[PDB]
Structure 1
Amino acid sequence: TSIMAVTFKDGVILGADSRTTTGAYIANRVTDKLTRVHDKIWCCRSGSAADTQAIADIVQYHLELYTSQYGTPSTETAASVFKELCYENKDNLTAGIIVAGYDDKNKGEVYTIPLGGSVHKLPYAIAGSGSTFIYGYCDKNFRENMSKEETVDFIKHSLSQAIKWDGSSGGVIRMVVLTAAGVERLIFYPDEYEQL
């Protein structure tokens, strides 16, 4: 599994490889790891798959609760909610989570949660155990406040590279683009990402 989220000047694009592997056998090759947990906020899921599938819904229930009573949350606010669940049940659950959200005052934001749970604000995040081969690539070809058009190519190339250099990362590269136009999903087949 490989996941990222990369802030740009109009937003943040969340990205994922959608292989799920139970041992060296593939359980399902299409599972979408980018999950909605609020309208303008999505989270990317990696690690032990069951555990994050679980945590994500618990965060979902807090943040619909937050909205009715106290007005809409933010990316900072949402990351906190994961961080409690991860921290307290750390001894039980393993979960790596990239939290990206979109606001109209902070624009895109990306927060990363490692497996013990700590909150860190970064201008882009990479998480997985299939993301451990894009590090040298990602530091050079990231540039802050980049064009929308360049965001498509960056994540395309970076995850594509992840697919060649990790046998558990593969399949459709799916992307969820968060802007003040709502949420647009995108999808890139092996015939497109690999050649480019």
Structure 2
Amino acid sequence: TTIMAVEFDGGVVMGSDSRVSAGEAVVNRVFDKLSPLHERIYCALSGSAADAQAVADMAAYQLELHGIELEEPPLVLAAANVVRNISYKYREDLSAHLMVAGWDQREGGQVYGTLGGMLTRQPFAIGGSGSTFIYGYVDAAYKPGMSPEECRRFTTDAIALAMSRDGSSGGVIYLVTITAAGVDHRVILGNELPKFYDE
């Protein structure tokens, strides 16, 4: 599991690998780790896939009631405060991690980190078990002010690196670019993952 988000000017880009493994044999070699919380707020799951799913659904419910009751698209800060509350209130019972990202009229693109029940906006907020192998790459290749294609090819590279080394991560790489226009869901097949030094 290696989910990743990036902040650029018009919006964000949430890459994520597509494997969920049970121990040493995989259960699902294609699994979209990006479940929408609203029209333009995706949460990248990780950890206990069941727990992450329940949190994504409850958070989508509250964000939808709060969404309609104000009659205006709920700000991402709202979403990461509800997922932050539900991840903090149950922290002894959920091994979940939800890099909730999205767009909103009042602030533009955002990527909030919510490991362990905390809330911290960040430029690029990578997570997942494979995320411990790409800190080097992302630190060496991240330059603020990235155009969208730079963000997409960037996170594709990073998750590619994590996929080659990590056993908890493999398969295809999903990418979505959230902006004022809408969501642009894309998929990276295993024949298209950019090849790195293989030996």
TM-score, normalisation: structure 2: 0.94
In 1, the alpha carbon distance for the partners of 2:92 and 2:110 equals: 28
Q: Using the TM superposition, give the Cα deviation of residue 184 of structure 1 relative to its aligned residue in structure 2, in angstroms.
A: 0.6
Q: 1:113 maps to which residue?
A: 114
Task: Give ranges in structure 2 of 5+ residues lacking alignment.
Answer: none
Q: 2:30 maps to which residue?
A: 30
Q: 1:89 maps to which residue?
A: 90
Q: 1:167 maps to which residue?
A: 167
In 1, the alpha carbon distance for the partners of 2:87 and 2:106 equals: 28
Q: 1:134 maps to which residue?
A: 134
Q: Using the TM superposition, give the Cα deviation of residue 124 of structure 1 relative to its aligned residue in structure 2, in angstroms.
A: 1.2
Q: Which amino acid aligns with 1:187?
A: V
* Identical columns (%): 45
Q: 1:123 maps to which residue?
A: 123
Distance 1:149 1:194, change over 3 A: closer
Contact residue 129 and residue 168 of structure 2 kept, 8 A:
no
Deviations 1:74-102 (A, max 9, x none): 11110000111111111111111101011
In 2, the alpha carbon distance for the partners of 1:187 and 1:68 equals: 31
Aligned-residue CA RMSD (Å): 1.1
Q: 1:12 maps to which residue?
A: 12
- Larger proportion of strand: 1
Contact residue 74 and residue 104 of structure 2 kept, 8 A:
no
In 2, the alpha carbon distance for the partners of 1:26 and 1:177 equals: 28
Task: Give ranges in structure 1 of 5+ residues lacking alignment.
Answer: none
Q: 1:192 maps to which residue?
A: 192
SS of aligned partner of 1:125: coil
